[PDB]
Amino acid sequence: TENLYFQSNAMKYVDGFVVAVPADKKDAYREMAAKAAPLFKEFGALRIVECWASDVPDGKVTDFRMAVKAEENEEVVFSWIEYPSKEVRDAANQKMMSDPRMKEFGESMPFDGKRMIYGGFESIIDE
Amino acid sequence: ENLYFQSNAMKYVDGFVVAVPADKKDAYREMAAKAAPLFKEFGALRIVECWASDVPDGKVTDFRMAVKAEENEEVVFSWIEYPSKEVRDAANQKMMSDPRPFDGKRMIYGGFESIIDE
Ligand code: NA
Ligand code: NA
């Protein structure tokens, strides 16, 4: 529910992900993320959001499909995880990597890990 | 099963990834601060702009290649949340019809439907 104190103060750091996912694997992907999400929260994540292409324009210089070298059978996913600080983000990711829960239902990735793009970013505007 | 939740719960997100000259960070922040109130007025739930902090280089793809970033530039990861595609479309149409520090063509942009929000 809306809470202006949490809204104002909670997030300071974001891990952003852009993924190419086979279109027929939408459900598999959603299920994987639904399994991962509570784990990230356990480790200090504030929120995990995964968004499936709806209206993604094609360009000649750059575009979201070019960014993940998307193949004809694939759709672009735009996703992120919100954290209270870089330090919590770092701790969470280290934990995730040492968790057998994501060793299992996590190594069956319904997408090409090589083409995923990823980075940590500091919040500069959040309104 | 609750069809009211099913139909309404998930938000619609316009995602933006932008190459911005590193020396224009404040200019970029103040631009976004100015635009935010207008997007909210038009129906946005939230506007977020994030500046590169730990963005690894890759050989296949990475955030810098995604916006064909130049040596003097950093990557911004940004989004705007809406209740639905319809509000998103209305808000952007208002932006195009109505109102009032980065390489606009290299920016990548798209509308996306949230499928997980936890
Ligand atoms: Na293109
Ligand atoms: Na580490």
Side-chain angles (χ1 to χ4, degrees):
Chain A
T1 63
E2 176 167 296
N3 179 312
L4 291 169
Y5 176 71
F6 183 91
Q7 195 183 294
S8 181
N9 295 322
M11 187 278 274
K12 296 186 162 48
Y13 201 87
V14 171
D15 267 3
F17 304 77
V18 189
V19 194
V21 178
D24 51 288
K25 298 306 175 218
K26 184 174 188 181
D27 281 300
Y29 185 88
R30 183 167 32 204
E31 294 166 51
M32 189 200 74
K35 292 207 166 74
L39 294 181
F40 275 114
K41 298 263 276 204
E42 175 185 317
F43 300 150
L46 300 166
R47 185 185 181 203
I48 293 78
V49 187
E50 304 258 4
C51 307
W52 190 266
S54 159
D55 179 26
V56 178
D58 172 72
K60 296 305 191 182
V61 174
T62 55
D63 61 49
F64 264 116
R65 291 185 71 77
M66 295 172 80
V68 295
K69 300 179 170 169
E71 275 150 36
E72 292 182 55
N73 65 307
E74 298 181 323
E75 294 279 15
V76 178
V77 171
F78 181 87
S79 299
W80 73 91
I81 304 175
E82 299 190 27
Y83 288 105
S85 59
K86 186 170 186 299
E87 295 77 14
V88 172
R89 175 262 198 174
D90 292 337
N93 291 331
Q94 203 73 64
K95 291 177 186 173
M96 182 57 78
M97 292 189 67
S98 69
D99 205 300
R101 282 170 295 184
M102 274 307 287
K103 280 281 286 290
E104 293 161 17
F105 272 87
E107 278 177 58
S108 66
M109 284 177 287
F111 63 90
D112 187 359
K114 276 175 168 184
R115 282 179 295 120
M116 179 180 68
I117 63 180
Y118 164 77
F121 301 81
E122 54 146 18
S123 177
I124 62 163
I125 298 286
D126 184 353
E127 294 293 330
Chain B
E1 174 174 301
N2 182 305
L3 298 167
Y4 178 85
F5 303 154
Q6 172 177 334
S7 160
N8 294 288
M10 300 315 283
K11 292 170 177 161
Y12 191 92
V13 177
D14 266 8
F16 301 78
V17 181
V18 189
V20 176
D23 54 278
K24 295 269 178 187
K25 180 168 172 175
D26 298 329
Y28 187 91
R29 194 194 308 116
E30 84 154 41
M31 169 191 161
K34 292 180 188 165
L38 296 182
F39 274 114
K40 302 210 72 189
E41 185 186 342
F42 299 161
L45 302 182
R46 190 189 185 192
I47 293 82
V48 186
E49 308 263 356
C50 307
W51 190 265
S53 154
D54 179 21
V55 179
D57 305 294
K59 80 162 288 291
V60 183
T61 55
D62 64 38
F63 269 112
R64 293 182 68 75
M65 290 183 265
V67 289
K68 294 178 171 181
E70 302 203 4
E71 286 171 26
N72 63 309
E73 288 175 333
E74 294 287 0
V75 178
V76 166
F77 183 89
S78 182
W79 73 89
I80 303 178
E81 303 187 27
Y82 294 101
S84 67
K85 187 168 177 301
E86 284 67 39
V87 182
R88 176 260 198 173
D89 282 344
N92 287 333
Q93 170 185 337
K94 282 167 187 191
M95 284 297 187
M96 301 297 168
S97 313
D98 175 70
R100 291 74 156 162
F102 66 96
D103 187 299
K105 147 182 260 193
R106 279 185 296 139
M107 162 183 82
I108 62 178
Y109 165 77
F112 301 82
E113 291 267 4
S114 73
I115 60 175
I116 290 294
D117 184 352
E118 279 209 51

